[PDB]
Design a protein around this nucleic acid. Structure first.
Length: 51
RNA sequence: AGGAGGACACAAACGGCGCGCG
């Protein structure tokens, strides 16, 4: 996943938000889950390119 | 003798300057 975030682990801060309501949980699991974003929307190129 | 009477509630903010990190 670190490729998608452009996340180098050299002291990189990152934020967490908790979806509260039912629809928020379902929307997260259906649209924003890691396994639902294996293709880049900018071109037909995987974002899970091996590290 | 008889007889008569008699207090509930209530938890810290806004603008600069500087530095630093992603």
């Amino acid at each position: 996943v670190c490729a998608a975030y452009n996340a180098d682990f050299d002291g990189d801060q990152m934020a967490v938000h908790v979806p509260l309501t039912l629809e928020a949980q379902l929307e997260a699991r259906a649209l924003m889950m890691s396994t639902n974003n294996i293709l880049s929307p900018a071109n037909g190129e995987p974002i899970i390119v091996p590290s």
